[PDB]
Design a protein around this nucleic acid. Structure first.
Ligand SMILES: [Mg+2]
Ligand SMILES: [Mg+2]
Ligand SMILES: [Mg+2]
Ligand SMILES: [Mg+2]
Ligand SMILES: [Mg+2]
Ligand SMILES: [Mg+2]
Ligand SMILES: [Mg+2]
Ligand SMILES: [Mg+2]
Ligand SMILES: [Mg+2]
Ligand SMILES: [Mg+2]
Ligand SMILES: [Mg+2]
Ligand SMILES: [Mg+2]
Ligand SMILES: [Mg+2]
Ligand SMILES: [Mg+2]
Ligand SMILES: [Mg+2]
Ligand SMILES: [Mg+2]
Ligand SMILES: [Mg+2]
Ligand SMILES: [Mg+2]
Ligand SMILES: [Mg+2]
Ligand SMILES: [Mg+2]
Ligand SMILES: [Mg+2]
Ligand SMILES: [Mg+2]
Ligand SMILES: [Mg+2]
Ligand SMILES: [Mg+2]
Ligand SMILES: [Mg+2]
Ligand SMILES: [Mg+2]
Ligand SMILES: [Mg+2]
Ligand SMILES: [Mg+2]
Ligand SMILES: [Mg+2]
Ligand SMILES: [Mg+2]
Ligand SMILES: [Mg+2]
Ligand SMILES: [Mg+2]
Ligand SMILES: [Mg+2]
Ligand SMILES: [Mg+2]
Ligand SMILES: [Mg+2]
Ligand SMILES: [Mg+2]
Ligand SMILES: [Mg+2]
Ligand SMILES: [Mg+2]
Ligand SMILES: [Mg+2]
Ligand SMILES: [Mg+2]
Ligand SMILES: [Mg+2]
Ligand SMILES: [Mg+2]
Ligand SMILES: [Mg+2]
Ligand SMILES: [Mg+2]
Ligand SMILES: [Mg+2]
Ligand SMILES: [Mg+2]
Ligand SMILES: [Mg+2]
Ligand SMILES: [Mg+2]
Ligand SMILES: [Mg+2]
Ligand SMILES: [Mg+2]
Ligand SMILES: [Mg+2]
Ligand SMILES: [Mg+2]
Ligand SMILES: [Mg+2]
Ligand SMILES: [Mg+2]
Ligand SMILES: [Mg+2]
Ligand SMILES: [Mg+2]
Ligand SMILES: [Mg+2]
Ligand SMILES: [Mg+2]
Ligand SMILES: [Mg+2]
Ligand SMILES: [Mg+2]
Ligand SMILES: [Mg+2]
Ligand SMILES: [Mg+2]
Ligand SMILES: [Mg+2]
Ligand SMILES: [Mg+2]
Ligand SMILES: [Mg+2]
Ligand SMILES: [Mg+2]
Ligand SMILES: [Mg+2]
Ligand SMILES: [Mg+2]
Ligand SMILES: [Mg+2]
Ligand SMILES: [Mg+2]
Ligand SMILES: [Mg+2]
Ligand SMILES: [Mg+2]
Ligand SMILES: [Mg+2]
Ligand SMILES: [Mg+2]
Lengths: 84, 52, 64, 96
RNA sequence: CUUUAAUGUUUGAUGUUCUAACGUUGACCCGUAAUCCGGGUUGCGGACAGUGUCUGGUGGGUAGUUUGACUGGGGCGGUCUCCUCCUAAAGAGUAACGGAGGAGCACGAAGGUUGGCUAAUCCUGGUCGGACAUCAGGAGGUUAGUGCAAUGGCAUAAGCCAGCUUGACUGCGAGCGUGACGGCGCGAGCAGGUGCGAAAGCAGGUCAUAGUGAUCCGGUGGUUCUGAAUGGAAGGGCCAUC
RNA sequence: AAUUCCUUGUCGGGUAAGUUCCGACCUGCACGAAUGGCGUAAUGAUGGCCAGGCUGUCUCCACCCGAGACUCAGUGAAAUUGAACUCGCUGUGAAGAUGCAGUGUACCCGCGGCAAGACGGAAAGACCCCGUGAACCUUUACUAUAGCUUGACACUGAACA
RNA sequence: GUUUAUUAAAAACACAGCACUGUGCAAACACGAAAGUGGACGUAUACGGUGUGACGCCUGCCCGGUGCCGGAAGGUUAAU
RNA sequence: UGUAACGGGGCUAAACCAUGCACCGAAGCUGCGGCAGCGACGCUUAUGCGUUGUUGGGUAGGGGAGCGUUCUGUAAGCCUG
RNA sequence: AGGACCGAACCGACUAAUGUUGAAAAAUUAGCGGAUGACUUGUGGCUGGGGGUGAAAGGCCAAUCAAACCGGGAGAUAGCU
RNA sequence: UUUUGUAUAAUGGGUCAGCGACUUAUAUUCUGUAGCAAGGUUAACCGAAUAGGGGAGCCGAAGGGAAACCGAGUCUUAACU
RNA sequence: CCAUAGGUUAAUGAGGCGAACCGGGGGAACUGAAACAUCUAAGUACCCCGAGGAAAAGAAAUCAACCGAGAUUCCCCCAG
């Protein structure tokens, strides 16, 4: 009689969470090959003993402690592995 | 899905083949690439054949 | 009476030395031109059954 | 194996391999089993008489497992490398 | 050899007639004291029909069943997988029929490498020429660009030109990330062989994140791995692939 | 209109007054010609409307006759039922209280009556939803199939063209 | 006239009548694995099915779809 | 439906604000006594004995230990007119 | 003459009231329809369950019918109480 | 009892007495216990017989690999740091 | 026409019942598959026919594997 029923919502979608972030923090001893940061861009940049992956993933090429540091004229954030 | 699939047969006599795709409308000419043949352990020209 | 073996699991799993089960990976039967060769190369070798799903296997394969 | 209506693991996963009929008629032999025969000679019929390998068996290897303390003629059987060295060191005579 | 005239049989098709199969819910006789049945004489039909097996069609006449879930009650409507942002509370993750947008590809170069270059817009002047083509200078300084959505990146350019090319390699892979699992991802380095570069070096697809589908069954090529007495083979297995 | 949503359509009639009725109009949401159209005498335990007579239908009930109800004697059930020493109110609270809190009121026990409550009794709600329930029915749902039909071979042969 | 025995007697069913259509007789059809039987001891002025529903005036257009009927040149097509 | 918007009576403080000392008030804590679990430590363990701490709400559920019943052996025994 | 008329038997069942643990697992009372016909009734017979029969309501088939009853498969199954 | 949650005006029960629901068989895994121990164990059957015999067989002391096959290693691979 | 069909006599036998087991002819569905149609249930239940104290089967056109065994039936393994 009266239940003016109706509507919808074109906005139901979303994607899965990719679990990005910093996996190993500073002063944190890692093995060689350990993923430090997963990220889209180069929000961070690779310093000493640190490689950049295909997806801008920062992994350790050697063993030692993680060092976050800011260098360069653009004040970019570099991640390096100190020797250990 | 216009990009059909083909195979790149070794010209070394082996039946080894890489599989790949191409647009046969815009690229009518055959694809020929020099690829590694793990049987002969050499780089040999492969040629386009049908995926069959 | 005897327990009957699930014959599919007997065709899919093999018991190892310490009691674990080896199995073939999935995803290596077709649709293979779009898959990276690294992926396939890490899918050819047999893998061990994980600790979580190892109980259902033992229930299906009582006779090893 | 019922996981709800989810495809169970034994059907998610592919079949592999086949079954060898020859493996059922092959056998492996300890070195410690070599003393359990009589006559100091080791054949298939000797091992079957000693109730070691079984009747339907037609092939047998001798494997470095255990140890033997006696000279034993081995005849018509495969022998591993370590079993050949241990038998020949213990006085054996591998032949055909 | 091209094209057949004769003869005959192997023979099909189409008629043509026949009778002997078969049919007769035609007549008459007998069993018989009987409108069944059988036998007999006979007439008509006649190899048709009709029955059996096989086979194509039709077939709710009958039978067995199926006909999804979420859902501010059910239905109708909308949705169902993947990607991007917010909600999301400065690690990760986090729901609603919450707010907004996209994907189900493309590229044999739009990949690799070497070398070089650096935008948008506006201002002034200038043949056709115009708000807006091309040209020169100046401001500006990435407000542009990125094959496509958004976000994050990008000048050492990941953006734009040209040269050479196929690393859009094969076997592996320490070690980590992520998931209940299946699984997904990153990966230095090792062996082989290769491309560019003088060289150091770089390259195991594309700036990244969507561009997808388990198993079974079956197909194709390769491989002696197996091969039900033996030798092969079929089939199967493994590798690649659909 | 047995069909008209809007609609108590509009006009007229009948009535003091008529969403019904009758007659017209046609703007037929969404009549219509053998799933028949329009009429139609008679008939109808048929539907709707009106009038006369009639009357306790009513205004508004009154009295009377009888059968019970009531009392005595005799026989003698039933549904139901956790236990009961079984009040009202306002509030609280599984959200509508005999039973909790606060307060008020109330000597104990019957009999005749009424039926507001005991979410009273009766019937594992028939509505609604659910169930990877059932049944029946339908069809251009799926898969089959009886049946009907086609042809091949057999029972089935001879001649001539 | 009939009907829901036990909440529905009606405008529902039936009806005489009408029309379409099938059926040539061993009829169609129906019950039956079949033999047989009904139709019918009847023979198209008969039988079956379907729709309509006395009577009166009437019953208009559409064959595209779905069915049915008829066709047989061509295409396609089974067992063999 | 009946005061019915302090729980009521009633209160001009028996209300509110500030400060302070008292007291009441729980199955909390302490005291006295008793049981059990788990750990220490030591004995010379009867593998449990002192001391010692500490623990002891509980559904689904998991673990441990028991009572009693009927029947068989012990039992042609023992109790019982 | 008449599926003619009024109206008892007979057949039926329109309305109201009672009753509804009834007198009665569908009746009584007062009225009601047909009543020479497509009537009604007695006795005997036939049709059987996916079947019958049906002036057709999914009606009836022993107080049971969108597929009777009884026995069996059978302790069907029950993600439900 | 079911529940987020019941004095609930949600379910069930009038009461008493009696009956009334996690069993049984065979396989398999784990724990405990007992026996033997790199061995352990027999089934059918025989046997007058819960003995003894019977070791057919089963599990275990070796695994890897799809497999052939190799073997304390093996597979992968042309070959593995 | 013989004949045959048919008729009649006579003799012998059968017929029916019954618990299970047995062989054969037919032959389900619920259920399970978390639906269901292949499949399962299950050649089960059930119906029918026939026999005996047991029946059935049975004396290799069999297995095996180049060595060999030597009818049938039953039990334990092989082996889930
Ligand atoms: Mg709704
Ligand atoms: Mg494959
Ligand atoms: Mg043995
Ligand atoms: Mg149906
Ligand atoms: Mg739903
Ligand atoms: Mg966060
Ligand atoms: Mg946070
Ligand atoms: Mg906030
Ligand atoms: Mg460059
Ligand atoms: Mg200009
Ligand atoms: Mg580039
Ligand atoms: Mg990109
Ligand atoms: Mg499948
Ligand atoms: Mg071979
Ligand atoms: Mg062979
Ligand atoms: Mg209308
Ligand atoms: Mg109206
Ligand atoms: Mg008026
Ligand atoms: Mg009136
Ligand atoms: Mg009118
Ligand atoms: Mg009409
Ligand atoms: Mg019409
Ligand atoms: Mg009448
Ligand atoms: Mg009395
Ligand atoms: Mg009583
Ligand atoms: Mg009250
Ligand atoms: Mg109240
Ligand atoms: Mg009273
Ligand atoms: Mg009352
Ligand atoms: Mg009363
Ligand atoms: Mg209910
Ligand atoms: Mg009648
Ligand atoms: Mg009647
Ligand atoms: Mg009735
Ligand atoms: Mg009535
Ligand atoms: Mg006839
Ligand atoms: Mg009609
Ligand atoms: Mg009419
Ligand atoms: Mg017409
Ligand atoms: Mg038409
Ligand atoms: Mg037509
Ligand atoms: Mg036709
Ligand atoms: Mg055709
Ligand atoms: Mg008041
Ligand atoms: Mg004070
Ligand atoms: Mg106290
Ligand atoms: Mg205490
Ligand atoms: Mg104490
Ligand atoms: Mg406790
Ligand atoms: Mg406590
Ligand atoms: Mg006793
Ligand atoms: Mg009359
Ligand atoms: Mg009467
Ligand atoms: Mg009359
Ligand atoms: Mg109906
Ligand atoms: Mg009845
Ligand atoms: Mg039935
Ligand atoms: Mg039925
Ligand atoms: Mg059953
Ligand atoms: Mg039951
Ligand atoms: Mg209860
Ligand atoms: Mg509730
Ligand atoms: Mg309470
Ligand atoms: Mg109460
Ligand atoms: Mg209660
Ligand atoms: Mg309930
Ligand atoms: Mg009760
Ligand atoms: Mg009991
Ligand atoms: Mg044990
Ligand atoms: Mg032990
Ligand atoms: Mg079924
Ligand atoms: Mg079934
Ligand atoms: Mg099922
Ligand atoms: Mg015999």
């Amino acid at each position: 009689a009266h239940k003016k029923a109706g509507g919808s919502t074109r906005n139901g979608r979303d994607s899965e969470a990719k679990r990005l972030g910093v996996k190993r923090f500073g002063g944190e001893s890692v093995l060689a090959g350990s993923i430090i940061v997963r990220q889209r861009g180069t929000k961070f940049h690779a310093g000493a003993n640190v490689g950049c992956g295909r997806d801008h993933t920062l992994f350790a090429k050697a063993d030692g402690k993680v060092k976050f540091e800011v260098k360069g004229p653009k004040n970019r954030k570099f991640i390096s592995i100190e020797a250990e | 899905g216009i990009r059909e699939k083909i195979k790149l047969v070794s010209s070394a006599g082996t039946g080894h083949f890489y599989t790949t795709t191409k647009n046969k409308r815009t690229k009518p000419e055959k694809l020929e690439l020099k690829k590694f043949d793990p049987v002969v352990r050499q780089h040999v020209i492969y040629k386009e054949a049908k995926i069959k | 009476p005897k327990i009957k073996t699930v014959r599919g699991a007997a065709k899919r799993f093999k018991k190892t030395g310490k009691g674990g089960f080896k199995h073939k990976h999935a995803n290596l039967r077709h649709i293979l031109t779009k898959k990276a060769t690294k992926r396939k190369r890490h899918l050819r070798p047999k893998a061990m059954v994980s600790k979580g799903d190892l109980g259902l296997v033992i229930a299906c394969l009582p006779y090893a | 194996g019922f996981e709800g209506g989810q495809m169970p693991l034994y059907r998610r996963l592919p079949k592999f391999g086949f079954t060898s009929r020859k493996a059922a008629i092959t056998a492996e032999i300890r070195l410690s089993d070599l003393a359990k025969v009589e006559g100091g000679v080791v054949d298939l019929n000797t091992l079957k008489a000693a109730n070691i390998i079984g009747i339907q068996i037609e092939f047998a290897k001798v494997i470095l497992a255990g140890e033997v303390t006696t000279p034993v003629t081995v005849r018509g059987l495969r022998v591993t490398k370590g079993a050949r060295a241990a038998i020949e060191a213990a006085g054996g005579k591998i032949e055909e």
